[PDB]
Amino acid sequence: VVIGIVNNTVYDPLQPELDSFKEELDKYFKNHTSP
Amino acid sequence: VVIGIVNNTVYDPLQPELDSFKEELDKYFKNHTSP
Amino acid sequence: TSGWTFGAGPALQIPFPMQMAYRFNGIGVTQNVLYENQKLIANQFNSAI
Ligand SMILES: *[C@@H]1O[C@H](CO)[C@@H](O[C@@H]2O[C@H](CO)[C@@H](O[C@H]3O[C@H](CO)[C@@H](O)[C@H](O)[C@@H]3O)[C@H](O)[C@H]2NC(C)=O)[C@H](O)[C@H]1NC(C)=O
Ligand SMILES: *[C@@H]1O[C@H](CO)[C@@H](O[C@@H]2O[C@H](CO)[C@@H](O[C@H]3O[C@H](CO)[C@@H](O)[C@H](O)[C@@H]3O)[C@H](O)[C@H]2NC(C)=O)[C@H](O)[C@H]1NC(C)=O
Ligand SMILES: *[C@@H]1O[C@H](CO)[C@@H](O)[C@H](O)[C@H]1NC(C)=O
Ligand SMILES: *[C@@H]1O[C@H](CO)[C@@H](O)[C@H](O)[C@H]1NC(C)=O
Ligand SMILES: *[C@@H]1O[C@H](CO)[C@@H](O)[C@H](O)[C@H]1NC(C)=O
Numbered sequence: 082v083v084i085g086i087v088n089n090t091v092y093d094p095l096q097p098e099l100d101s102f103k104e105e106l107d108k109y110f111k112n113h114t115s116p
Numbered sequence: 117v118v119i120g121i122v123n124n125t126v127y128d129p130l131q132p133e134l135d136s137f138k139e140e141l142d143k144y145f146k147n148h149t150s151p
Numbered sequence: 152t153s154g155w156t157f158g159a160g161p162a163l164q165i166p167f168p169m170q171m172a173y174r175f176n177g178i179g180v181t182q183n184v185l186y187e188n189q190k191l192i193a194n195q196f197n198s199a200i
C-alpha cells in the first residue's frame with residue numbers, strides 16, 4: 082500500500098542475545114556428549 | 117483499589133518466541149536421546 | 152518546500168508526503184494512516200480547494 086518504500090534489513094535486539102544462549106546451548110549439547 | 121476494572125488475559129511478546137525456543141529445546145533433547 | 156524549518160532557521164528540504172505524516176503525528180494520529188490513505192487524502196484536499 083505504501084508508495085516509496087525501500088528494501089533493507091531490520092536488525093532486531095532479542096535475536097543476538099538469545100543467539101548467545103543458542104551458541105551456549107549448542108556448546109552444552111556438544112560437551113554433554115563428551116562424558 | 118481501581119473501581120470498574122474488568123477481567124481478561126494479557127498477551128506478552130516474549131512468551132511466544134521463547135515458547136518456540138522451548139519447543140526447539142524439547143525437540144533437541146528428544147533427538148539427543150535417540151542415539 | 153521545507154515545512155516549518157524555514158521560519159526557525161536554515162531552510163531544510165523535506166518531502167511533502169513525509170511533512171503531512173509529521174503533521175498527523177502532531178495531531179496525535181500515527182503516521183501510517185497517511186501512508187495507507189495518501190490517494191484518498193489527496194483527493195479530499197483537491198476537492199476542498
Ligand atoms: C525487497 O525484497 C522483496 C522481497 O524479496 C522484493 O520483492 C520481490 O520482488 C520480486 C520482483 O519484483 C518478486 O518476484 C516475483 O515477481 C512476480 C510477481 O510480481 C512473479 O511472477 C515472479 O515469478 C517472482 O516470483 C518477489 O516475489 C518479491 N518478493 C516478495 C516476498 O514479495 C523487493 O523487490 C525488494 N526491493 C526492491 C527495491 O527490489
Ligand atoms: C477475574 O479474575 C480474578 C482472579 O481469579 C477474580 O477474582 C476472584 O473473585 C472471586 C469472587 O469474587 C474470589 O472468590 C473468593 O470470594 C470470597 C472473597 O470475596 C472468598 O471468601 C471465597 O472463599 C472465594 O475464595 C476469588 O478469590 C478471586 N480471585 C483472586 C485471585 O482474588 C475476578 O472475579 C475475575 N473477574 C470477574 C469479573 O469475575
Ligand atoms: C521521484 O521522482 C522521480 C522522477 O522525478 C521518480 O523516478 C521516482 O520514482 C520518484 N520517487 C518516488 C519515491 O516516488
Ligand atoms: C563439560 O562438562 C563437564 C562435566 O560433565 C565439565 O566439567 C566441563 O567443564 C564442561 N566443559 C565445557 C567446555 O562446558
Ligand atoms: C455503571 O452503572 C451501573 C448502574 O447504573 C452499575 O451497575 C455499574 O456497576 C456501573 N459501572 C461502573 C464501572 O461503575
Ligand SMILES: *[C@@H]1O[C@H](CO)[C@@H](O)[C@H](O)[C@H]1NC(C)=O
Pocket residue numbers: 147148
Ligand atoms: C538429530 O541429531 C543428529 C546428529 O547426529 C542429526 O544428524 C539429525 O539431523 C538430528 N535430527 C533432528 C530432527 O534434529
